[PDB]
Amino acid sequence: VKQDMPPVGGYGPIDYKRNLPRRGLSGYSMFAVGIGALLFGYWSMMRWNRERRRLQIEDFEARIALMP
């Protein structure tokens, strides 16, 4: 017998495609969810700032009543 290195009856194929998934969101959906979380942060920001101004006015009234 002979003992070279042949391929055994043929081998499987190997791909040659530029395999790209291009996944992720679109323009509109990513854009809208970013602006939506932005507006959520704005609303909570507005609420905290106006309640904070209430308390800071109370601090002003403390210094007024303390002064003379």
């Binding site: 979380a37 942060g41 920001m45 905290w48 700032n49 101004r53």
Partner: protein, 299 residues
């Protein structure tokens, strides 16, 4: 006790920057397929310590007063620029500290230009002049964006900022402004993708990476964090430290990935893409509190 406060600030800057160098080298190593370094001692700690030692025993050679005066300014910025950073109780309660950040970044630009003048008439000094020009083209963007993100905070005092960050983070009312500012932090740290660019190299290197840690701590304070609960500030310290660490790893992690710009592409990109967008976001942040009736309590 106040000099003890100073020593407890500026003794961990050496350990902080050296362990930052081992952390960034190990992190780049695992970004690639590298265990670098682990052979030299237990997980590579004596390797940065003794390597810093070897860098101090290099015996170099040589205008001399200028060559003295540049890295001393760089490293005294690296020391004196963690003063008002409000890890819960800051060192000095400055009434304004962010403008001090801007002023000492300009002092770092002084440092780079003095080193370039000390480099004794070289094509390297022409390149360092270009680096001075690109570094000075950024404090416009950083100051204007910083102005807008403090505009929702009223005062410059930064304790008001740690008050503002209790309900939600400030990353949500200004995320693209924050994105541009973080790119400007990449810009001010003079590292990748924003490059290029003798001794004492340890002191100059120390200045750059303490500037990095300053920019990351200031990023972490400016946009997010936790709540300052009194009579247990260490909880805020731990949560702040963890977030700043993750941001600095992300900062080196973004450095690990992209080729560096062209100089003229860098200028082109800077002016014609950040600068109108800064102005537009900033005028919208000016007209925002008058259209939400929420101006902050400027005390």
């Amino acid at each position: 006790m106040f000099m003890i406060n100073v020593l407890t600030l500026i003794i961990p800057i050496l350990l902080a920057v050296a362990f930052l160098t081992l952390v960034e080298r190990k992190v780049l190593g695992y970004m690639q397929f590298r265990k670098g370094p682990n052979v030299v001692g237990p997980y590579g700690l004596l390797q940065p310590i003794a390597d810093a030692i070897k860098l101090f025993i290099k015996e170099p050679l040589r205008s001399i007063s200028m060559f003295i005066l540049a890295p001393i300014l760089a490293l005294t910025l690296a020391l004196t620029m963690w003063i008002p950073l409000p890890m819960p109780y800051p060192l000095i309660n400055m009434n304004l500290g962010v403008l001090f950040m801007l002023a000492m970044s300009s002092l770092a630009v002084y440092s780079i230009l003095w080193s370039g003048w000390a480099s004794n008439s070289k094509y390297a000094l022409i390149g360092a002049l270009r680096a001075v020009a690109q570094t000075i083209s950024y404090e416009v963007t950083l100051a204007i964006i910083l102005l807008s993100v403090l505009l929702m905070n009223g005062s410059f005092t930064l304790s008001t900022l740690i008050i503002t960050q209790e309900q939600v983070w400030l990353i949500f009312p200004a995320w693209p402004l924050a994105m541009m500012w973080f790119i400007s932090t990449l810009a001010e740290t003079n590292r990748a993708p924003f490059d290029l660019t003798a001794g004492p190299f340890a002191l100059f290197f120390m200045a750059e990476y303490a500037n990095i840690i300053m920019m990351n701590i200031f990023t972490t304070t400016l946009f997010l964090g936790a709540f300052h609960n009194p009579y247990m500030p260490e909880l805020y310290t731990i949560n702040f430290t963890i977030k700043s660490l993750l941001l600095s790893i992300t900062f080196l992690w973004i450095r690990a990935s992209y080729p560096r710009f062209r100089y003229d592409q860098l200028m082109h990109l800077l002016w014609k893409n950040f600068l109108p967008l800064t102005l537009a976001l900033c005028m919208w942040h000016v007209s925002l509190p008058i259209l939400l009736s929420s101006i902050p309590p400027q005390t």
